[PDB]
């Protein structure tokens, strides 16, 4: 739990009154998306 | 007063680089110091106001 985290992070089992800084919050990208031009101007393939 | 600032070292020195993380914690606790000093002059900041 955060008590702990701050006692760990204070290396004592009494913390005073007062605001620790424990860690860090950090969002992960949750999906991966790729994009490249949408035209596509079709080589004459199908015209041969 | 200056500006009230803070510095992720696990972030600051690489990014998404999780490599990095076990690389960085071998070196030691150069940035528990640095974190400590950051929130030191933070505070300063706050007593000099």
Do not use: H, W
Not at chain 1, 11 to 19: M, W
């Amino acid at each position: 739990d955060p008590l702990s985290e701050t006692k760990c992070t204070l290396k004592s089992f009494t913390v005073e009154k007062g605001i620790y800084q424990t860690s860090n919050f950090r969002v992960q990208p949750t999906e991966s998306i790729v994009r490249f031009p949408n035209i596509t101007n079709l080589c004459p393939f199908d015209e041969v | 007063s200056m500006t009230k600032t803070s510095v992720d070292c696990t972030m600051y020195i690489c990014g998404d680089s999780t490599e990095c993380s076990n690389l960085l914690l071998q070196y030691g606790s150069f940035c528990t110091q640095l974190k400590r000093a950051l929130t030191g002059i933070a505070v300063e900041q706050d007593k000099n106001t």
